From Swiss-Prot, chain A:
It comes from the Eukaryota. The lineage of its organism: Eukaryota, Metazoa, Chordata, Craniata, Vertebrata. It comes from Homo sapiens (Human). Heparin binds at K57, K58, I59, I60, K61, K62, L63. The modification Phosphoserine is found at S22. Disulfide bonds join C6-C32, C8-C48. This is Platelet factor 4.
């Protein structure tokens, strides 16, 4: 067992893409058995998203085409 | 005044451990793609190159 | 090929939430200082000792 | 939504094996700061903020 655990202890499906200033996609590894989608909000609040194509492939658009 | 001035596509997807997508803002006209390699090394990816497209898919666990 | 081409000192240590110190390597002749502000923005910092020292002491103390 | 990345720290590490160090400020995610070092192979470990070791690794990292 390593020093690290998943940063995401829970997730949220309640988010309007416009509120997000940053999205980090972290691949699974020794630190976490699952992938993680960490979104940062305008205000500096960070949340984790569930891995469904909707939200993310959508949020990525709002950020990638801005 | 972006952090990602000089980009690259000279990256082996299998070496990317994470990808941060940053929205264009007051200090950068365009969105930025910052990838981290296992080495810990951080590089910027080309928003116009097709690489990051399949890169993000690999991290999602193929 | 460094990620940090142009660096800056125009930052408020009070708004930095994380600092990534990257060792100089085969792809970058010098160390690289990457700070993350609360709003998510990322910037490269000048290597000026007094700067990162003031920044690390603050992050490592809240 | 977030918690501490570090659940424990290691002390048996060669300062010259560290290619990267991440200094994370305490906040809602973790009530304590954290020191995450990546190693030459890509392995990540956390460092004790009490021990003087990390201060050594930092200065050794910045001076190239």
């Amino acid at each position: 067992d390593g020093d690290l655990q998943c940063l995401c202890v829970k997730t949220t499906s309640q988010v309007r893409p416009r509120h997000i200033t940053s999205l980090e996609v972290i691949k699974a590894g020794p630190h976490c058995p699952t992938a993680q989608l960490i979104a940062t909000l305008k205000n500096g609040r960070k949340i984790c998203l569930d891995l469904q194509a909707p939200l993310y492939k959508k949020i990525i658009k709002k950020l990638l085409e801005s």
